């Protein structure tokens, strides 16, 4: 005669140590503006 709940711990703390996903997310942005500038030059 007993019941219990449970609480999760989210972990995935390798990502969580940083903001969350910055491996191919923030770097992609970094190099994608570079693509934009080079294409601007190519079209110019």
């Amino acid at each position: 005669g007993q019941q219990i709940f449970s609480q999760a711990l989210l972990n995935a703390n390798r990502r969580g140590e940083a903001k969350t996903a910055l491996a191919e997310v923030q770097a992609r942005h970094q190099e994608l503006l570079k693509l934009e500038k080079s294409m601007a030059e190519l079209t110019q």
Binding site: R28, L35, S38
Partner: peptide
Amino acid sequence: SRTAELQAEIDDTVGIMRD
């Protein structure tokens, strides 16, 4: 590695076409 290759290809087309 795809994005770097695309950047390189764009740079090369830029070079050809500056010429």
